[PDB]
Amino acid sequence: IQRYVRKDGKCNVHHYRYLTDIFTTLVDLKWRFNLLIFVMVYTVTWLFFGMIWWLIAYIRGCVTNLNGFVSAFLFSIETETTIGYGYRVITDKCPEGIILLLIQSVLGSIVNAFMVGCMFVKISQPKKRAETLVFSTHAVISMRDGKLCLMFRVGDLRNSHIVEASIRAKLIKSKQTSEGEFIPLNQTDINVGYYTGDDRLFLVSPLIISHEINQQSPFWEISKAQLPKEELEIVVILEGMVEATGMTCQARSSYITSEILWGYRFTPVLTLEDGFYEVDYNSFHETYETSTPSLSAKELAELANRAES
C-alpha cells in the first residue's frame, strides 16, 4: 500500500452541494482561469445591461450619441465602471431609463464586491505561509535522558512569527478489532506535548519535537528489528496563525516506516554570531547515528525496572 500523505502535504485521496458556496470554489482556481472568469462576468453584465439600454432605446426612437451594437456596448462600460466619458450622456425623456441606470449602477457594486473581494481573498490566502514552514526529512528514534524518543525537527524560514502555533501528530495504520472489524486507515493521536502545553510552540529557531515512547505510545513494542517490518505512517501537523493577518494555517508532512531512522540523532543548527544567533540551515535535515539499544521501549523499561539493586 502507498502513503496517505506526501512529504509536502498533499493527500493521496480522491472524492452537487458545491454550488451552495460558489464562492469557496471560486477562490480555488489557478490565476489564469480566475482572471478569465473575472473577464467573463464583467463583459457579460456589460452585455446584458447594455442590451436593455438598446431595448428601451428601440421603443423610444435618455439617449445621446448611440447608434449600433458597437456603440451600446461602450455606454454600459462608461456606467458600470462609472467611467462616463461625456460623449454618451443621459437625458430626461423616458422613465425606463432613469430606473434602469439605478439598477445598473447599484448592481455594478454587487458585481464589484463579488469579484474584488474574491480577488482579495486569494491574494491573501493563508495556505501560502505553510510553504515556508518545514519539517525534517526523516524522523529519528534515539535515547534522551534515559527514555527512548521519536523525534522530528520543525522549522520556520520566514522571519515573521506564527502566533498561537501548535504541533500535533497522528499515527496512521490499519488495524483489526478483536471482534473482527478491519479499519482501513485508522488514526490515533501521538503525544507530542499535549498534556503539558509543551505542544504549544514558540517557533523561532528550528525545534525538535519529541514524542516519548512510553506505555501509551504506539511505538511501545516496536524494536529496531520490528520497525522495518511495520506498515505505519506518522502524519505531522502544524497549525497556527500568520502574525501579519488573522489567518489560521496548517502545514503537514508524513513519515513512512522507512523514513524513521532508529539509532540516529539530529545535527545541531545553532551558533552564536557576535550578538545574534546563526541558524546553519544546511544541517537542518541532516542527522548522524549514535549508540542506541535495539530493544523495544517496552523491554528497555522492563530491564531497567529489574535493575533495582
Is residue 80 near Na ion by the rule CB under 5 A? no
**Residue 261's closest CA among 285, 237, 227?**
227
Q: In angstroms, what is the minimal distance from the CB of 101 to Na ion?
A: 41
Looking at beta carbons only, is 84 or 228 nearer to K ion? 84
Helices 69-80 and 31-60 meet at what angle, rounded to 10?
120
Tell me how far apart the alpha carbons of residues 163 and 144 are, in angstroms, rounded to a whole number.
29
175-204: which residues touch a second copy (CB under 8 A)? 177-185, 187-189, 193-194, 196-198, 200, 202, 204
Is residue 12 near a second copy by the rule CB under 8 A? yes
**Residue 126's closest CA among 23, 239, 12, 254?**
239
Is residue 4 near a second copy by the rule CB under 8 A? yes
70-99: which residues touch K ion (CB under 5 A)? 82, 84, 86
| Radius of gyration for the alpha carbons in the chain, expressed in angstroms and rounded | 31
The residue behind cell 501537523 is: 237
Q: In angstroms, what is the minimal distance from the CB of 28 to a second copy?
A: 7
| Residue 142 bridge partners (DSSP) | 149
Q: In angstroms, what is the minimal distance from the CB of 204 to Na ion?
A: 5
124-153: which residues touch a second copy (CB under 8 A)? 124-129, 131-132, 142-146
Is residue 64 near K ion by the rule CB under 5 A? no
**Residue 248's closest CA among 118, 123, 120, 125?**
125
Is residue 268 near K ion by the rule CB under 5 A? no
DSSP code string of 192-217: SSTTTT-SB---SS-EEEEEE--TTS
Binding range to a second copy, per CB under 8 A, among 96-104, 218-226, 254-262, 299-307: 96-104
Q: In angstroms, what is the minimal distance from the CB of 268 to a second copy?
A: 6
The residue behind cell 430626461 is: 92
Is residue 294 near a second copy by the rule CB under 8 A? no
Helices 31-60 and 95-123 meet at what angle, rounded to 10?
180
How is residue 29 written as a grid cell?
Answer: 482556481
Yes or no: say if 26 and 118 are a contact pair by the CB < 8 Å rule.
yes
Is residue 278 near a second copy by the rule CB under 8 A? yes
Q: In angstroms, what is the minimal distance from the CB of 48 to a second copy?
A: 15
Is residue 121 near a second copy by the rule CB under 8 A? yes
Number of residues that bind a second copy (CB under 8 A): 133
Binding range to Na ion, per CB under 5 A, among 40-48, 148-156, 180-188, 232-240: 148-156
Question: Within 10 Å of residue 189's Cβ, how many Cβ atoms?
Answer: 11
183 touches, from Na ion, a second copy, K ion, none (C-beta below 5 to 8 Å by class): a second copy
Looking at beta carbons only, is 156 or 233 nearer to Na ion? 156
Looking at beta carbons only, is 123 or 307 nearer to a second copy? 123
Is residue 246 near K ion by the rule CB under 5 A? yes
Is residue 228 near a second copy by the rule CB under 8 A? no
Long-range contacts of 21-25 (CB under 8 A, 24+ apart): 23/114, 23/118
Among 45, 52, 56, 78, binds a second copy (CB under 8 A): 78
Is residue 48 near a second copy by the rule CB under 8 A? no
The residue behind cell 437625458 is: 91
Give Dmax (Cα) for the chain. Answer: 111
Site residues for Na ion per CB under 5 A: 156
